[PDB]
Amino acid sequence: KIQGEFQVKLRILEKSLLNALSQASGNILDDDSVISTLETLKKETTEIALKVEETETVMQEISEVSALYNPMALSCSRVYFAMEELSQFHLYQFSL
Amino acid sequence: LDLENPQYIAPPVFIQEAEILMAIPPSHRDAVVSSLVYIHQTIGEANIRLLKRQGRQNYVTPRHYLDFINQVVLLINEKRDQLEEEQLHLNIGLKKLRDTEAQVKDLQVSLAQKNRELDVKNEQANQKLKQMVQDQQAAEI
Amino acid sequence: QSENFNTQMSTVVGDVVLASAFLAYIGFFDQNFRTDLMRKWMIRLDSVGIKFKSDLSVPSFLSKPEERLNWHANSLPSDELCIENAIMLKRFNRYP
């Protein structure tokens, strides 16, 4: 979910890099806009090269925990439909 | 709606279809539009399979084809636009990088020209410091 | 980031077609039939010669990640099925 910031923070940071370039073209090597903006971009860009280190944990934990519950969850499904088969007798009517 | 593609080729199967309406060599538009017909028909098939395999019944009249076609155009207008705007920013911006690098890449070389000169204006000048010692010191005799 | 789009912008034609049919014919059918139909539509787009994401995700391709989460919060099954229906009940075009 947090990846929603990664996109926007990078979306704006890109517009600043350009809006910061439309001022240099003269004092380039000695300008803050063309220097800071770009520096900020590089640093915060390593977020998917540094942070993702934990992502592989979630992307894995989820599947692992699921297979550890799926067998149980599946049981409920079958247990349910068993009742849905009881509808055969007008009296035994069970809604999900 | 531009459904024409220049790099298209129209595979053999599609060609054998276009004939046995679609300009000699099947065009991209034909590829898409022709498929729309295929897709629509598969449903009739699927609806018969249902009634058979399962116990339900469904129908697929032209009303759907229109809902389908109308849906097909609406999305290609929504997705294409968002994609273009996203390419507009990428293109415009990328022009600055390729260009700004040219201004800097070359500037560094010009700056290297100044240092390439200093090596002569400083080393050869510093050589005057050698003749100053070799002469003054030897003159101290 | 620019290269990535060149490919995305090339499959837009196919993704729209597939996603469209999904929103005008699928709805009625169940998992089995739904899955089957999709394969046919894709096999067709290939036989003919049209680019499209191999593993296209209609639900995702037709709704931001922020929109979905809200659906579940508003009482909606978290299965792969209801998430698809949620998409149909949104971009619908002939009163659900």
How far apart, in Å, are the Cα atoms of B72 and each of A64, A80, B18, C15, C83? Answer: 39, 40, 22, 10, 21
B71 vs C contacts (CB less than 8 Å): 20, 23-24, 91, 93
Resolution (A): 3.8
Query: Max alpha carbon distance in chain A (Å)?
Result: 87
Nearest to C27 by CA among C90, C91, C84: C84
Let me know the angle formed at the C-alpha of A26 by A22 and A27, rounded to the nearest 5 degrees.
100
- Two tokens, residue A32: 């803050």
B92-B93-B99-B105 Cα dihedral, nearest 10 degrees:
-170
Q: How far apart are CA C69 and CA C62, in angstroms?
A: 14
CA–CA min distance C93, chain A (Å): 29
CATH architecture of A1-67: Helix non-globular (6.10)
Instruction: Indicate the helix (H) or strand (E) that contains C49.
Output: none
Q: Which of B85, B86, B89 to mutate to test the interface with A (most CBs of A within 10 A)?
A: B89
| 8-state DSSP, A26 | S
